């Protein structure tokens, strides 16, 4: 049952203080966008930068196996939103993120599924 | 001063109707880099400024439109360029794109090795190419010859080319081919202005020739703007993206003969209203070399 545990590796690697995964593609773009998380085209809001997502997949970048029966891969041919202070490690934020199925938006970056929504508005 | 709103600057025409002898290419603003926004590779850059020149001209945009593009990999392994062509093109647009060494792609399919074992059965609308391969200031054949060939037999009536030549990364064919276009130029992207580099850029391909280019003077042409005209080195045009997109036009697509090919169809074509191909599944391959 033996497998490469890539993402532990990369993971560990930066707690031990190991330079990040560099040369994403950035993309210009308005910073106007929906600030979604994976998106077909750029989406960055004014607090996102937009990459290529194939640069920024550890198993794109790595050459390895995407972790799926189906060898699926999220980020390639798409354009993934990074938080500006997570930049830095576009690799390494997206390993450790997950998309809300529901509204799209990163959990703990975006996504306000689980707010009160107590007071509605007119 | 005007120029540097621009994303670049295309050859005047009158360049085009000259007769000049070749010599060095010597730019007064060379040696120089522009101010690119943080975290922008010169790549991306580039471009981005090729596809908002891209956007002012007649390009045919069919629905499934299909784009093929050439010497995509960076020294780092990734496709800067690729991933900017992904952003301009309507999403759904396929994008092949190709290079000698391995690199990752957001493109829908990607072919590693030399130009020459890449094979398509189809027709593309689109050919960019950023491949490089210089060479006494004379004719260069090499991946050159191959994109003439690749012009000539797989690019749709009506498709357009971007084809980066510099001083000495340049082919007389290429320019040749330019007059088998509706209308041609050489764009500078004013990033990369202080570079010799342009891109040769064919708009709506007629499958014969309107114009009779000797390749060898239209070079000299070609360098002969860049020694008179310098171009300031801009990154203005980077900073609004929101025209960036390109206009999904559903350009009309249809297959006919060679035979059918009349004054109307090519005047719909040299206006980017038409684009003449088969629309079977797009299959690509890479030619591997066996040896034990
Ligand atoms: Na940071
Ligand atoms: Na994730
Ligand atoms: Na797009
Ligand atoms: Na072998
Ligand atoms: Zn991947
Ligand atoms: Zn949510």
């Given at each position: ?122 | ?87 301009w093109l309507p999403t759904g647009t396929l994008l ?60 749709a009536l009506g498709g357009s080319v971007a084809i ?110 038409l684009i003449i191909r088969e629309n079977n599944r ?11």
């Amino acid at each position: 049952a033996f497998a490469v545990d890539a993402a532990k590796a990369y993971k560990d690697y930066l707690a031990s203080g190991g330079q990040p995964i560099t040369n994403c593609v950035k993309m210009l773009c308005t910073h106007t966008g929906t600030g979604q998380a994976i998106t077909v085209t750029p989406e960055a809001n004014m607090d996102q930068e937009s990459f290529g997502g194939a640069s920024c997949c550890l198993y794109c970048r790595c050459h390895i196996d995407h972790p799926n029966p189906k060898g699926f891969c999220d980020l390639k041919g798409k354009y993934v939103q990074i938080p500006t202070t997570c930049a830095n490690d576009p690799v390494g934020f997206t390993l450790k993120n997950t998309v809300c199925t529901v509204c799209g938006m990163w959990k703990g970056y975006g996504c306000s599924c689980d707010q009160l929504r107590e007071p509605m508005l007119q | 001063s005007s120029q540097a709103w621009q994303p670049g600057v295309a050859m005047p025409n009158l360049y085009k109707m000259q007769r000049m002898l070749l010599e060095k290419c010597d730019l007064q603003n060379y040696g120089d880099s522009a101010t690119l926004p943080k975290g922008i590779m010169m790549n991306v850059a580039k471009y981005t400024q090729l596809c908002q020149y891209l956007n002012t001209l007649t390009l045919a945009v069919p629905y499934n439109m299909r784009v093929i593009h050439f010497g995509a990999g960076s020294d780092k392994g990734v496709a800067p360029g690729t991933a900017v062509l992904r952003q301009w093109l309507p999403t759904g647009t396929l994008l092949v794109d190709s290079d000698l060494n391995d690199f990752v792609s957001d493109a829908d399919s990607t072919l590693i090795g030399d130009c020459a074992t890449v094979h398509t059965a189809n027709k593309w609308d689109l050919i960019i190419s950023d491949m490089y391969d210089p060479k006494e200031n004379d004719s260069k054949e090499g991946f050159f010859t191959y994109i003439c060939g690749f012009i000539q037999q797989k690019l749709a009536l009506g498709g357009s080319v971007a084809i980066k030549i510099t001083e000495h990364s340049w082919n007389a064919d290429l320019y040749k081919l330019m007059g088998h276009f509706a209308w041609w130029t050489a764009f500078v992207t004013n990033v990369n202005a202080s570079s010799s580099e342009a891109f040769l850029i064919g708009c709506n391909y007629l499958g014969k020739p309107r114009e009779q280019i000797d390749g060898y003077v239209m070079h000299a042409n070609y360098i002969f703007w860049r020694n008179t005209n310098p171009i300031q080195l801009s990154s203005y045009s980077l900073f609004d993206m929101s025209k960036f997109p390109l206009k999904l036009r559903g350009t009309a697509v249809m297959s006919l003969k060679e035979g059918q090919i009349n004054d109307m169809i090519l005047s719909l074509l040299s206006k980017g209203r038409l684009i003449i191909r088969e629309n079977n599944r797009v299959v690509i391959s890479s030619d591997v070399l066996v040896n034990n």
